[PDB]
Amino acid sequence: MNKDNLRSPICCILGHVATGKTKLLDKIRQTNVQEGEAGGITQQIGATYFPVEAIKQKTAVVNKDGKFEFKVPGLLIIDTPGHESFSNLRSRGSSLCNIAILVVDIMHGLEPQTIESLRLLRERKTPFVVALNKIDRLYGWKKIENNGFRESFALQNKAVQNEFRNRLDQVKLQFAEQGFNSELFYENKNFARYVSLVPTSAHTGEGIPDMLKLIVQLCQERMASSLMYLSELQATVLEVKAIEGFGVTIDVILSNGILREGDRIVLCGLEGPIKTNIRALLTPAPMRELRIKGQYIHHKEVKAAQGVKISAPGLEGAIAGSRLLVVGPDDDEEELEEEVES
């Protein structure tokens, strides 16, 4: 359990259309992905890597005394489409994650794809918190940019505080009807068993510090302890696409283990196993999206979890969703081809 064998866990963001999943991530990243999107909607799985240094800075306003202990090296956050036509991608993102944020519009409560998401979460026993987003839409909300929720909530007028309590109670009742007990996050005395509700605004940043602290807490206090450390390689192909200068590449979620430039890799292809070597192992800059076209950073080595793009010859027939394996010293290359096909 050395700190040079720590693993960055995977957090999926799930929720109904237009609840603010991408906008929340844009506020954390300081990006404008949502503005860029056709229709303002997400149509693919996105991956952004957050080094723990950034998480520490973005939670300082709810950790002023420094007493919160950070143990993760970072977190890979997966953005997903809420639109009904992409249930396959919510399913894939859910299958990949270790923990999750379920985004609910506080003004609307639970909606059809919230219910779909809750089924995914319950089935896989995924620890999650709920972001009750768009609190700035409470009428008369007075913002302090990027504040902790409690601090800001204390400064609101009586009308706003009453409206919040009323909507919060309604949402709690909705979750209870779906079989989930939930509590406002600082009122939750059973983090292991009850869902924490953290009110947020993607527009003002309020509550995001609380939300980030909570997902680190999910990693450190709910996720299986073994997942804090790197073990055997696990990787999944997300997409296959030709990129200028690199030929047909694959975007991969590295879920566990370590990938290296030059690795002999095996994966499923249309006509049978593909066996090739990694020519370039690419990532976005930290806190930038895998689903966004850009210049890429080349790495000799990438430790899990991360979203990577791999350049290699012979990827033309790669199958999205395929597992990916690396040929190790004690492996037989053909035997490994047979194992990936399984």
Contact footprint for Mg ion (CB under 5 A): 21-22, 42
Residues that bind Cl ion (CB under 5 A): 127-128
Site track 19-38 with ligand GSP (rule: CB under 6 A), x = hit: xxxxx----------x----
Tell the smallest beta-carbon distance from residue 89 to Cl ion (Å).
22
Q: Single out the residue of 12, 98, 116, 136 in contact with ligand GSP (rule: CB under 6 A).
A: 136
Which is closer to Cl ion, CB of 191 or CB of 246?
191
Residue 17 interface partner, choices Mg ion, Cl ion, ligand GSP, none, CB cut-off 5-8 Å depending on type: ligand GSP
Nearest residue relative to ligand GSP (C-beta): 82
- Output the smallest distance, CB 234 to Mg ion, in A: 26
* Interface with ligand GSP, residue 134, by CB under 6 A: yes
| Residue 137, contacted partner among Mg ion, Cl ion, ligand GSP, none, CB below 5-8 A by kind | ligand GSP
* Closer to Mg ion by Cβ: residue 22 or 255: 22
Distance CA 108, CA 137 (A): 11
117 touches ligand GSP by CB under 6 A:
no
Residue 127 binds which entry of Mg ion, Cl ion, ligand GSP, none, CB below 5-8 Å type-dependent: Cl ion
Task: Tell me the number of residues near ligand GSP by CB under 6 A.
Answer: 23
- For ligand GSP, the closer of residues 22 and 126 by Cβ is 22
Which residue lies nearer to Mg ion by CB, 21 or 134?
21
Q: What residues numbered 36-65 form the site for ligand GSP, per CB under 6 A?
A: 40-42
**Calpha distance 105→111 (Å, rounded):** 9
**Cα 195 from Cα 133, distance rounded (Å):** 15
- Per-residue interface string for the shown chain with ligand GSP, residues 72-111, x marking contact by CB under 6 A: ---------xxx-------------------x--------
Q: Under the criterion CB under 6 A, does residue 137 sit at the interface with ligand GSP? A: yes
Residue number with CB closer to Cl ion (93 or 127): 127
Task: Report, in Å, the least distance between residue 211 CB and ligand GSP.
Answer: 12
Q: What is the 3-state secondary structure (H, E, C) of the chain?
A: CCHHHECCCEEEEEECCCCCHHHHHHHHHCCCHHHHCHHHCCCCCEEEEEEHHHHHHHCHHHCCCCCCCCCCCEEEEEECCCCHHHHHHHHHHHHHCCEEEEEEECCCCCCHHHHHHHHHHHHHCCCEEEEEECHHHCCCCCCCCCCCHHHHHHCCCHHHHHHHHHHHHHHHHHHHHCCCCEEEHHHCCCCCCCEEEEEECCCCCCCHHHHHHHHHHHHHHCCCHHHHECCCCEEEEEEEEEECCCEEEEEEEEEECEEECCCEEEEEECCEEEEEECCEEEECCCCCECCCCCCCEECCEEECCEEEEEECCCCCCECCCCEEEECCCCCCHHHHHHHHHC
Contact mark string toward ligand GSP, 185..204, x via CB under 6 A: ----------------xxx-
Q: Which of 154, 116, 159 lies closest to 138, judged by CA?
A: 159
Cβ neighbours, 10 Å, residue 326: 17
CB of 72 to Cl ion, least distance (A): 18
Q: Which residues bind ligand GSP (CB under 6 A)?
A: 15, 17-23, 34, 40-42, 81-83, 103, 133-134, 136-137, 201-203
